[PDB]
Amino acid sequence: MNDKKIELLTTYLSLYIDHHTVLADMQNATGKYVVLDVRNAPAQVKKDQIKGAIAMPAKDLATRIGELDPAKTYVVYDWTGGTTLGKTALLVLLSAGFEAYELAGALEGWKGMQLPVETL
Amino acid sequence: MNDKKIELLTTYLSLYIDHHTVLADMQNATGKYVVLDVRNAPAQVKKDQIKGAIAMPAKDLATRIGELDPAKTYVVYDWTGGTTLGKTALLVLLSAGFEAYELAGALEGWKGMQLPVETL
């Protein structure tokens, strides 16, 4: 029905965070968002990464979560976000009591918007 | 269990509309649907669109919604159904009372079927 739609769209969209809100934190250096690059692939294949992001493959997050700080709010991203890799990671983080979102648009969006990207 | 999977799939699928139903609208010219290209990327990168679509990014659809017909049914689309643009636009529309759906297959699936695309 019309209610179930709004309810599903509200929760679903809640799993994401606007890339603008992440860009504002990044510039203002207010540091309240930590960006996790959760795609599975060697640095040789990725060669890219959002400015200040922390490499942490999705298939290892459930085993390396102890490196993260609970008080921080995490923002995870994959190659395109059109896969289930972002949500997979998110479920782990949300269950461990963390507060995390999937970056709307993912890496593709971010590079397409010409936003800060580094090589390292 | 499956009762949960079935409930999600039913609501989720109700957010979309088959491209076979939208095409049949413009070929028979019944003015039943209005196609909205909610892509945020600039006109340059887009280069083309769906024959008859009204370009209107998901980021502005919230304000430019004053130029839409409350009685008409709207169908939003993007490059690929792998982003929250369609769903965000749907939250905006379905909330203002409008009735809308996401174009199943986005522009990518519409081109793959060699369907009519107007350059602009």
Added chain:
Amino acid sequence: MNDKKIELLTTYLSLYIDHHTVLADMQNATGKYVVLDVRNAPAQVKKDQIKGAIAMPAKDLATRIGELDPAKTYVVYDWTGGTTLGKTALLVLLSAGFEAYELAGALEGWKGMQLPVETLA
């Protein structure tokens, strides 16, 4: 919103099945998964499919319901992870009592990994 999102992510992810699981089952001839290509596009359009897959159009799934064995585990796949035919089928299948899962990554991600994909004619 916490539990709601954990509920959604859990149920949503239970729809799919890892591709490492589907491949490791066809390369080991374990055959515990029956892959179904539920694309509605004609053969002339989709001149390729996952190796050893049954062409079960999502639009003819109910019409040919008797051709499915309620004992086998079905794995459906679409064009890309954005299309909705995979989930449309999953609905008919799950409701009819069948055990089904949607291939994570769809054909697009299956081809982009150099995985086995024969061509029909």
